[PDB]
Every structure is written in structure tokens, then in C-alpha cells.
Amino acid sequence: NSFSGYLKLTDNVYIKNADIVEEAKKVKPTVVVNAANVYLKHGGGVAGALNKATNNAMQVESDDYIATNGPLKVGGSCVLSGHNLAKHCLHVVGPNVNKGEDIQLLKSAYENFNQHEVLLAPLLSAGIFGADPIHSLRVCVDTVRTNVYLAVFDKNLYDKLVSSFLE
Numbered sequence: 001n002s003f004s005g006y007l008k009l010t011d012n013v014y015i016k017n018a019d020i021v022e023e024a025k026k027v028k029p030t031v032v033v034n035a036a037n038v039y040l041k042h043g044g045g046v047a048g049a050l051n052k053a054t055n056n057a058m059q060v061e062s063d064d065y066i067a068t069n070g071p072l073k074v075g076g077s078c079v080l081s082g083h084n085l086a087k088h089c090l091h092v093v094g095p096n097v098n099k100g101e102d103i104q105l106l107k108s109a110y111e112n113f114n115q116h117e118v119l120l121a122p123l124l125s126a127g128i129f130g131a132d133p134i135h136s137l138r139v140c141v142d143t144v145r146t147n148v149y150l151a152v153f154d155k156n157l158y159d160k161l162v163s164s165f166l167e
């Protein structure tokens, strides 16, 4: 868990302008969070990038999990191997509001983080999932009670988020 260059927002939330994949390779965290969908199909975005860094091992493991257990619920999670990125990967499904899912499920999604003492995570439901990223940071700060290190791979958005938090 050798996180470097993060800015501490609250006693348990830290943030950095960084690619979560590069962070996971350098830090070797106990847990890395994937921004998953309910069938664990890592087709693009954060999930595709994490799977590619495992050379597709994450996708094969995910398909076997879904065969035995069925899909996740929106707001839910499962723990699978971290492969070369972490000890464990926490696959968390935030709502996709561009596909009509309820933004109130973002609180449920972040509540999954509280079962793990330390996590490297992306900003849930941001990007093409369509949630307002400033709102997602506020739900993270108000919900997560364990130690979360957020990697946001866009300097423009990182600056907006920090300036929103410090108002």
C-alpha cells in the first residue's frame, strides 16, 4: 500500500491525478476496485483497462464467477483475484444513469468499500456511466469510512474535484 503523491481530502479519503492501472502496478494495493457492470463484461473504460493489464485473466475468472453465481445487482459487488494488480479485486457496480439506473444506488455502491480496510478505486459512475463526478465525490466522502485512495485519470477533472471539495 505504498501510495504516493495523493492529496488528503478527509481523514479517510485521498485523491490523485493518475491512471488506476499504473497506480495498481506501482502500489500493489491489497484491494483495487473495478468499475464493473452486472455481468462482469470488461469491454472498455476502466474495467477494460484493468482486464487488459491482467492479459485477460480477469475476464476468464469473471465469466466463471457469473456462470456459477449469476449476475450482480446494481449497487452490489463481489471479491475476485487481484491478479498482478492487487491481492484482491472488488468488482463494484455503480448505477449507469445514461442507461436509466437510479443515482441513489451510488450510496449502496460505495458502501461495498467499507468491508476493506484500504482500497485503490476509481470515481464510481463517472465518465460514460453519466453521474455528475462532483456528486460522486461527495457520496464517496459521506459514505466510505475505511481508507480510500481515488485515482482520477484526467487533470482537468481532478482540478475541478479538488476545487469543489475545498469550497
Ligand SMILES: CC(C)[C@H](Nc1ncnc2[nH]c(-c3cnn(C)c3C#N)cc12)c1ccc2c(c1)S(=O)(=O)CCC2
Pocket (backbone or CB within 6 Å): 018, 019, 020, 021, 035, 044, 045, 046, 047, 049, 122, 123, 124, 125, 126, 127, 128, 129, 151, 152, 153, 154, 157
Ligand atoms: C472520469 C474518468 C477520467 C475516469 N477514468 C479513469 N480513471 C482512472 N483510471 C483510469 N484509467 C483509464 C484507462 C487506462 N487505459 N485506458 C485505455 C483507460 C480508459 N478508458 C481510465 C481511467 C472514469 C471513472 C469512472 C468510470 C469511468 C471513467 S468509465 O467511463 O470507464 C465508466 C465506469 C466509471
